[PDB]
Amino acid sequence: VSDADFATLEKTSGGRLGVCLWHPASGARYGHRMDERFPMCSTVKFPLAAAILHRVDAGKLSLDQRVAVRQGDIISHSPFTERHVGKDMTVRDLCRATLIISDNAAANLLLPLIDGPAGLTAFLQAQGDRITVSARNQPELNHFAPGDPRDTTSPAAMAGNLQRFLLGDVLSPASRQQLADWLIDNQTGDARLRAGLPQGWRVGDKTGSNGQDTSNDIAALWPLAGGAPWLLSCYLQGSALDDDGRDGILRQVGELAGARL
Ligand SMILES: *C(=O)[C@@H](NC(=O)[C@H](N)c1ccccc1)[C@@H]1N[C@@H](C(=O)O)C(C)(C)S1
């Protein structure tokens, strides 16, 4: 209900908590460290998917075109792409895999279609996000050092990107609704913002974790009653809490946001 509540939550969070709760239709905004840089981790996959869909909308790409999968493409935590070595996958299926289960090789196979991390960054800049910097592919995009902006975003920037790509018309209506359905089908966020959020809200989200001290969760919140959605951007970096502990913080971020709805 206030900015103070998130700053208080940070104290028990173990590290650096960044939260942006934003209601574009009213201009309401709440959070904490909303303009500081945080490692994106796997949340970079959300702008990656939007960049792909934008190129599809422009006719420079097809969701039905197929990308070849080679053994050298496979890296850790790639549950769908590892089954297609020696054949190909549609771009649409690559997008879905990287989004809803965080297929890492899927991300690496999509990136060259939008000219890699520099191409992702240029897309974000053209669309209005001048903070987010996408520099490396997987797994090294999960590296973070303070003062090193590579593969970082800010809670405000990523809430902005949720608004641009899901709510504005950066994307065609078919693309923006497919992107939404992918977030709604996310498989990795059940213990995170969703677990704290109140009944009556449809959640689409995308998560990330470095497995040691960082967990991120970005979400769109549509009222099932219909009406104007909220965006919720959460980055927890350098926490003493492990993944389950950081899940508990993300859950509590959902509980605070839920009271202000
Ligand atoms: C993106 O952040 C991905 N994270 C990793 O690949 C890490 N190396 C990793 C951390 C913990 C367990 C396994 C791998 C994917 N997003 C994470 C998440 O959303 O929690 C993931 C575990 C689903 S993998």
Is residue 78 a part of any domain in this protein? no
Burial class (CB in 10 A: 0-12, 13-18, 19+), 37: buried
Site to substitute for ligand 1 among 76, 78, 102, most atoms within 8 A of C-beta: 102
Cα(217) to centroid(ligand 1), Å: 12
126 within 8 A of 65, measured Cβ to Cβ: no
Transcribe 176-200 into DSSP letters: HHHHHHHHHT-SS-TTTHHHHSPTT
- Integer CA distances (angstroms), 144 to 28, 103, 119, 210, 249, in order: 31, 20, 20, 10, 20
Sheet-wide strand order for 28-32: 28-32, 16-23, 230-237, 215-223, 201-209
Is residue 70 a part of any domain in this protein? no
CA–CA separation, 251 vs 236, rounded Å? Answer: 12
> Taken in order 47, 52, 57, 58, is the CA torsion positive or negative?
positive
Active site residues: 42
Cα(114) to centroid(ligand 1), Å: 23
For residue 164, give the DSSP letter: I
Q: Which of 18, 5, 20 is nearest to 232 (CA)?
A: 20
Is residue 53 a part of any domain in this protein? no
Per-residue b or e along 123-148, where b marks 16 or more CB atoms closer than 10 Å to that residue's CB: bbeebebebbbbbebbeebbebeeee
Residue nearest to atom 18 of ligand 1 (CA): 208
84 within 8 A of 66, measured Cβ to Cβ: no
Q: How many CB atoms lie within 10 A of CB 80?
A: 18
Site to substitute for ligand 1 among 74, 77, 205, 247, most atoms within 8 A of C-beta: 77
Cα(168) to centroid(ligand 1), Å: 29
Token pair of 72, please?
């050298």
Is residue 48 a part of any domain in this protein? no
75 within 8 A of 138, measured Cβ to Cβ: yes
Q: Is the CB of 209 under 6 A from ligand 1?
A: yes
Q: Is the CB of 254 under 6 A from ligand 1?
A: no
Q: Is the CB of 137 under 6 A from ligand 1?
A: no
39 within 8 A of 213, measured Cβ to Cβ: no
CA–CA separation, 212 vs 215, rounded Å? Answer: 9
| 3-class state of residue 229 by DSSP | coil
CA–CA separation, 67 vs 94, rounded Å? Answer: 9
Token pair of 241, please?
């809490």
The boundaries of the domain holding residue 171 are: 3-43+116-228+236-259
Is residue 59 a part of any domain in this protein? no
Q: What residues contact 116, with CB distance under 8 A and at least 6 apart?
A: 137
CA–CA separation, 238 vs 259, rounded Å? Answer: 27
Is residue 158 a part of any domain in this protein? yes
Token pair of 213, please?
């001290």
Q: Which CATH number goes with the domain that contains 200?
A: 3.40.710.10
Closest ligand 1 atom number to CA of residue 102: 15
61 within 8 A of 83, measured Cβ to Cβ: no
- Integer CA distances (angstroms), 142 to 75, 134, 136, 242, 261, in order: 14, 11, 9, 16, 32
Cα(242) to centroid(ligand 1), Å: 13
Is residue 54 a part of any domain in this protein? no
Token pair of 145, please?
């050092």
Domain count, the chain: 1
Residue nearest to atom 11 of ligand 1 (CA): 211
Torsion of CA 255, 151, 42, 90, to 10 degrees: 140
Resolution of the determined structure in angstroms stands at 2.2
Cα(165) to centroid(ligand 1), Å: 23
CA–CA separation, 169 vs 186, rounded Å? Answer: 22
CA–CA separation, 192 vs 216, rounded Å? Answer: 9
Strand partners, 230: 221
Q: What residues contact 199, with CB distance under 8 A and at least 6 apart?
A: none
Is residue 79 a part of any domain in this protein? no
Q: Is the CB of 208 under 6 A from ligand 1?
A: yes
Taking each helix axis from N to C terminus, what angle separates 173-184 and 45-57, rounded to the nearest 10 degrees? 150
Query: Which experiment gave this structure?
Result: X-ray
